[PDB]
Amino acid sequence: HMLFQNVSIAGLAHIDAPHTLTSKEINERLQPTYDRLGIKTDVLGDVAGIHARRLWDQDVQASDAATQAARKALIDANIGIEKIGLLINTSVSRDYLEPSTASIVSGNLGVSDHCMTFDVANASLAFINGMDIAARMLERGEIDYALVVDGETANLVYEKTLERMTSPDVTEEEFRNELAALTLGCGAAAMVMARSELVPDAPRYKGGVTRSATEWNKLCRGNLDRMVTDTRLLLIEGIKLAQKTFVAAKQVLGWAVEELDQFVIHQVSRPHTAAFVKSFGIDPAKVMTIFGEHGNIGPASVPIVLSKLKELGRLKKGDRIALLGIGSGLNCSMAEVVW
Amino acid sequence: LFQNVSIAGLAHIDAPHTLTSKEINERLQPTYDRLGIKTDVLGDVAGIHARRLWDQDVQASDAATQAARKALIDANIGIEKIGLLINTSVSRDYLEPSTASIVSGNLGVSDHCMTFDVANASLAFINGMDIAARMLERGEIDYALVVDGETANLVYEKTLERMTSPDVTEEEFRNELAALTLGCGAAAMVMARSELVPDAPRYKGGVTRSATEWNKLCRGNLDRMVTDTRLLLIEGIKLAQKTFVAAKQVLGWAVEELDQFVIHQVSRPHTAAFVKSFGIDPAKVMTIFGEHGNIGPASVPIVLSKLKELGRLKKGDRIALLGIGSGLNCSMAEVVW
Numbered sequence A: 001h002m003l004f005q006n007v008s009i010a011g012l013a014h015i016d017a018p019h020t021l022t023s024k025e026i027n028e029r030l031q032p033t034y035d036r037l038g039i040k041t042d043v044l045g046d047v048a049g050i051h052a053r054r055l056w057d058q059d060v061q062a063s064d065a066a067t068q069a070a071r072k073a074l075i076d077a078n079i080g081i082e083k084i085g086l087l088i089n090t091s092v093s094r095d096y097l098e099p100s101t102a103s104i105v106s107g108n109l110g111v112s113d114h115c116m117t118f119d120v121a122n123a124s125l126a127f128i129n130g131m132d133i134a135a136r137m138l139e140r141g142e143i144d145y146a147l148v149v150d151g152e153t154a155n156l157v158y159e160k161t162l163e164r165m166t167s168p169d170v171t172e173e174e175f176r177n178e179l180a181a182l183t184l185g186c187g188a189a190a191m192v193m194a195r196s197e198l199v200p201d202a203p204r205y206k207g208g209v210t211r212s213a214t215e216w217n218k219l220c221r222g223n224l225d226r227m228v229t230d231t232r233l234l235l236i237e238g239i240k241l242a243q244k245t246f247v248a249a250k251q252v253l254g255w256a257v258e259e260l261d262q263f264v265i266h267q268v269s270r271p272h273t274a275a276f277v278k279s280f281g282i283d284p285a286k287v288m289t290i291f292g293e294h295g296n297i298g299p300a301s302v303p304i305v306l307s308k309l310k311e312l313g314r315l316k317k318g319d320r321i322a323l324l325g326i327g328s329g330l331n332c333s334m335a336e337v338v339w
Numbered sequence B: 001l002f003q004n005v006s007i008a009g010l011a012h013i014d015a016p017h018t019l020t021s022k023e024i025n026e027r028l029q030p031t032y033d034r035l036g037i038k039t040d041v042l043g044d045v046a047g048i049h050a051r052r053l054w055d056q057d058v059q060a061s062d063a064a065t066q067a068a069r070k071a072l073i074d075a076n077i078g079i080e081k082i083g084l085l086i087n088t089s090v091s092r093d094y095l096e097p098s099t100a101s102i103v104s105g106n107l108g109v110s111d112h113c114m115t116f117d118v119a120n121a122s123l124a125f126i127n128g129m130d131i132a133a134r135m136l137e138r139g140e141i142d143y144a145l146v147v148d149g150e151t152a153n154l155v156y157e158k159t160l161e162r163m164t165s166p167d168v169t170e171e172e173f174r175n176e177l178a179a180l181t182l183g184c185g186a187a188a189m190v191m192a193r194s195e196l197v198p199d200a201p202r203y204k205g206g207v208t209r210s211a212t213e214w215n216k217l218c219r220g221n222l223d224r225m226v227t228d229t230r231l232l233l234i235e236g237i238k239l240a241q242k243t244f245v246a247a248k249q250v251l252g253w254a255v256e257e258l259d260q261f262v263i264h265q266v267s268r269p270h271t272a273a274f275v276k277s278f279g280i281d282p283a284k285v286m287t288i289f290g291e292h293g294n295i296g297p298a299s300v301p302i303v304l305s306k307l308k309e310l311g312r313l314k315k316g317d318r319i320a321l322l323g324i325g326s327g328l329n330c331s332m333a334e335v336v337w
């Protein structure tokens, strides 16, 4: 069913950004605005369910964060950069409109003049898009190894959003529109993929399915210093698209929820995740969450969670792992890894 | 090499307003005299006499959508046949969502349609073609759209502001001069499985080489681009030369056996230096930078579209696509008409 054959995960790593910014600290700054607007509940901690997120230093570029994750992934795969035939950067954050962030990461790492490099961008689903693009090359044997890399920077969005929200003249509409920006987090991930013949004991990536609802492309719009979001509609329409995607997953992947061992789900908030889980009858014990302390790390979130599961010893040979995400667009992808 | 991939349709959009270099020079003149500049670098050296700008508030997605509708017409298919849409432009108005999702919503793609952006300076359209080719070959989709709209209005407005500020120095001038060689435009291409379109040109793919140590040489956002023009020409030509040598082995290329060269459009001296390297007949190399400037990753398919519309290509004609982009990355591929 066009599922990938002989494509494996040779190496995986994540980077947690070092600086903790608490929702309590945020609420401190926003309190005069809350009081003016008559907001009496903690919409960050109690409603969204986010208690903290991580930020980098101000001088860290997306390419820097991605470079860090990539070096750690190369070590996990026990290979040198000279073996990499393809490097794709999947992040929402970017250094410049041009050149690609991939070219910057590739120069930092010292790839060879045979290495193919470029960025893919697609909100929170891009890492999975990157894995599929690499998989198609690896399956046909065009390359032996690929790197998929992703660094996210939320520093500037916090800095400018907080300034706008605490201005004496901010409107209730603008405040509500920008609030979800304060659920984002910094972080990075990278994966080394390989032809299975080279790594017979490595986990296998099978791919999976994708569905879209691009008529909803206005729901969440972001730039370096601003994100505007219709949270209510994003939930309702996101969930509808996921159910459609699940029907497809059952068809091509043969999925039955009680037969899956882990669900690695992109997270936009605690209620969004709860609605998702309840929708498909998923065992909550099978769903790791880092949103509470890391917020939403965009397209890095899924591979960060998978890396964290690996490091926690939660994954064992033969485990069936579902990668699931809804991304601004809207887009929804569901794929399988067999550990 | 790709065996079962074809180009079902192709289209370009020329932007409607002309900004001549003569007119730029009139604005720049007091800066020129204050700095003792006696040369017309744009006109006499770069050989860019004009470029096109959009009406105000045309966004990248708008330009790309215009081109896509035209390319669907050229392919004789409705949007419901498209299983994949990739946007490859440098211009974008948001980091999220993809500019592809916005174009896709404009066009009304189906809920089965996979969409996303590829970014790779001026090489991204060829990258997007190759990504679509692999999906077509593998049987995942029947038809793909690759789209690209570029918006240079802002970069011109802000760059001309800076170059006329009374403080401006000659080094600042030289550092931003390359931004005055850019232009607006758009292109889109429909790719398909060959069994569906037997008379259509075949896309064979090609080879890719990189020189990623040179990533600092040209850096740009919507309002500003800085460029080391001298080193970029020298290193860009080195990499183009290496990739062309590689193309000679794996594609079997010999210069006298290719009918058209479709080159990324950078400047007269860039172009001249490449074709002299390999003794390429300049008559086999269509150029539009003279009046359109550098339209980034859309430059190559805009040229290909213009050749198609000129209507003088014939079946069996071997067409070399020579793409390159700030990075540096280079890719060369073959279409057989």
Ligand SMILES: CCCCCCCCCCCCCC(=O)SCCNC(=O)CCNC(=O)[C@H](O)C(C)(C)COP(=O)(O)OP(=O)(O)OC[C@H]1O[C@@H](n2cnc3c(N)ncnc32)[C@H](O)[C@@H]1OP(=O)(O)O
Pocket: A097, A098, B038, B039, B041, B045, B046, B090, B091, B121, B122, B150, B151, B152, B155, B173, B174, B175, B177, B178, B179, B181, B182, B183, B184, B218, B219, B220, B221, B222, B223, B224, B225, B227, B229, B230, B232, B233, B266, B267, B268, B269, B294, B295, B296, B297, B325, B326
């Ligand atoms: C970023 C997003 C924006 C929005 C989207 C946009 C579109 C899509 C995106 C596209 C993405 C874009 C991505 C990209 O990558 S675009 C980057 C590649 N493009 C360019 O570099 C632009 C064109 N550059 C050239 O054509 C050549 O380098 C020039 C013509 C400059 C020199 O060529 P050449 O080597 O043959 O000339 P020469 O050395 O013998 O000098 C002769 C004369 O010229 C004078 N001179 C030389 N250099 C400069 C200078 N820098 N400033 C001022 N003057 C200069 C010099 O003083 C001398 O004068 P005179 O003494 O004899 O008095």
Ligand SMILES: CCCCCCCCCCCCCC(=O)O
Pocket: B121, B122, B123, B218, B232, B233, B235, B236, B237, B240, B263, B264, B266, B270, B271, B274, B294, B296, B322, B323, B324, B325, B326
């Ligand atoms: C294969 C193209 C041959 C033309 C020679 C161009 C010289 C290299 C300069 C490349 C500059 C980057 C171009 C871009 O991203 O717009």
